[PDB]
Design an enzyme around this catalytic site. Structure first.
Site, PDB file in Angstrom:
ATOM      1  CG  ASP A   1      -7.622   7.319  -0.091  1.00 36.12           C
ATOM      2  OD1 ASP A   1      -7.481   6.131  -0.191  1.00 36.12           O
ATOM      3  OD2 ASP A   1      -8.686   7.861   0.165  1.00 36.12           O
ATOM      4  CB  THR A   2      -6.092   5.687  -5.677  1.00 31.91           C
ATOM      5  OG1 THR A   2      -5.978   4.379  -5.124  1.00 31.91           O
ATOM      6  CG2 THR A   2      -4.721   6.169  -6.203  1.00 31.91           C
TER       7      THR A   2
ATOM      8  NE  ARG B   1      -3.830   2.289   0.728  1.00 33.44           N
ATOM      9  CZ  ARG B   1      -3.694   3.616   0.608  1.00 33.44           C
ATOM     10  NH1 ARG B   1      -2.564   4.162   0.122  1.00 33.44           N
ATOM     11  NH2 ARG B   1      -4.695   4.426   0.884  1.00 33.44           N
TER      12      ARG B   1
ATOM     13  NE  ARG C   1      -3.318  -2.459   2.932  1.00 32.38           N
ATOM     14  CZ  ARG C   1      -4.191  -1.501   2.671  1.00 32.38           C
ATOM     15  NH1 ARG C   1      -4.810  -1.487   1.516  1.00 32.38           N
ATOM     16  NH2 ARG C   1      -4.320  -0.442   3.516  1.00 32.38           N
TER      17      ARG C   1
ATOM     18  CD  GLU D   1     -11.070   1.551  -2.183  1.00 36.55           C
ATOM     19  OE1 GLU D   1     -10.844   0.431  -2.668  1.00 36.55           O
ATOM     20  OE2 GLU D   1     -10.250   2.185  -1.393  1.00 36.55           O
TER      21      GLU D   1
HETATM   22  C1  THP Z   1      -1.818   4.282   3.748  1.00 39.78           C
HETATM   23  C2  THP Z   1      -2.019   3.667   5.092  1.00 39.78           C
HETATM   24  C3  THP Z   1      -3.228   3.014   5.360  1.00 39.78           C
HETATM   25  N1  THP Z   1      -3.432   2.401   6.524  1.00 39.78           N
HETATM   26  C4  THP Z   1      -4.682   1.741   6.908  1.00 39.78           C
HETATM   27  C5  THP Z   1      -5.575   2.828   7.524  1.00 39.78           C
HETATM   28  C6  THP Z   1      -6.949   2.460   7.042  1.00 39.78           C
HETATM   29  O1  THP Z   1      -7.607   1.602   8.024  1.00 39.78           O
HETATM   30  P1  THP Z   1      -9.148   1.175   7.753  1.00 39.78           P
HETATM   31  O2  THP Z   1      -9.167   0.026   6.752  1.00 39.78           O
HETATM   32  O3  THP Z   1      -9.562   0.710   9.094  1.00 39.78           O
HETATM   33  O4  THP Z   1      -9.907   2.359   7.215  1.00 39.78           O
HETATM   34  C7  THP Z   1      -6.715   1.706   5.722  1.00 39.78           C
HETATM   35  C8  THP Z   1      -6.843   2.559   4.462  1.00 39.78           C
HETATM   36  O5  THP Z   1      -6.358   1.746   3.380  1.00 39.78           O
HETATM   37  P2  THP Z   1      -7.099   1.752   1.945  1.00 39.78           P
HETATM   38  O6  THP Z   1      -7.260   3.191   1.427  1.00 39.78           O
HETATM   39  O7  THP Z   1      -6.284   0.788   1.109  1.00 39.78           O
HETATM   40  O8  THP Z   1      -8.457   1.178   2.232  1.00 39.78           O
HETATM   41  O9  THP Z   1      -5.377   1.326   5.764  1.00 39.78           O
HETATM   42  C9  THP Z   1      -2.379   2.450   7.507  1.00 39.78           C
HETATM   43  O10 THP Z   1      -2.609   1.946   8.653  1.00 39.78           O
HETATM   44  N2  THP Z   1      -1.221   3.089   7.299  1.00 39.78           N
HETATM   45  C10 THP Z   1      -0.975   3.694   6.135  1.00 39.78           C
HETATM   46  O11 THP Z   1       0.086   4.295   6.009  1.00 39.78           O
HETATM   47 CA    CA Z   2      -7.800   3.692  -1.552  1.00 42.22          CA
END
Ligand code: THP
Ligand code: CA
Length: 129
Positions: free
Chosen positions: A34-35, A29, A75, A37
């Site tokens: 943030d892209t 990731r 991830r 979905e």
């Molecule tokens: C980018 C990033 C996302 N995340 C977690 C936070 C978010 O938790 P939640 O799933 O509980 O919302 C989720 C967002 O990822 P996505 O945008 O891939 O869904 O990923 C991290 O913990 N650290 C990071 O640096």
């Molecule tokens: Ca996303």
């Protein structure tokens, strides 16, 4: 920060990609972005953009920041580079991602990315249109 090698296994969507890192398959990731979905507006375009960028690259690298290297889903959290070009920054610069998920200690490239977002927004690009 240090660039490390990886090889593409599979594009997934705008801000996630499956790479082989130290010989093991991992979902990465992308930090600080943030892209949308795939189901959302610009989601397919973000996915298409990242896909072309990683697939066309001769060399994929990952760069971890100073803090957590894996999230709660297992991830990998990194900046990724396609032939020396940061995928994270490029997405933002094109208006296909927002700066997001800026956590203390994993934010070395924050201001680089914010500057790209400002330029994208000024151009009214994609998400900013
Ligand atoms: C980018 C990033 C996302 N995340 C977690 C936070 C978010 O938790 P939640 O799933 O509980 O919302 C989720 C967002 O990822 P996505 O945008 O891939 O869904 O990923 C991290 O913990 N650290 C990071 O640096
Ligand atoms: Ca996303």
């Amino acid at each position: 920060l240090h660039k490390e090698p990886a090889t593409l296994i599979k594009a997934i969507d705008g801000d996630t990609v499956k790479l082989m890192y130290k010989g093991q398959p991992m979902t990465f990731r992308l930090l600080l972005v943030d892209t949308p979905e795939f189901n959302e507006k610009y989601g397919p375009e973000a996915s298409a953009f990242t896909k072309k960028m990683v697939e066309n690259a001769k060399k994929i690298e990952v760069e971890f920041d100073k803090g957590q290297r894996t999230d709660k889903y297992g991830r990998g959290l990194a900046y990724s580079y396609a032939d020396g070009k940061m995928v994270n920054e490029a997405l933002v610069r094109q208006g296909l991602a927002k700066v997001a998920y800026v956590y203390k200690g994993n934010n070395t490239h924050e201001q680089l990315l914010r500057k790209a977002e400002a330029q994208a927004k000024k151009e009214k690009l994609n998400i900013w249109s």
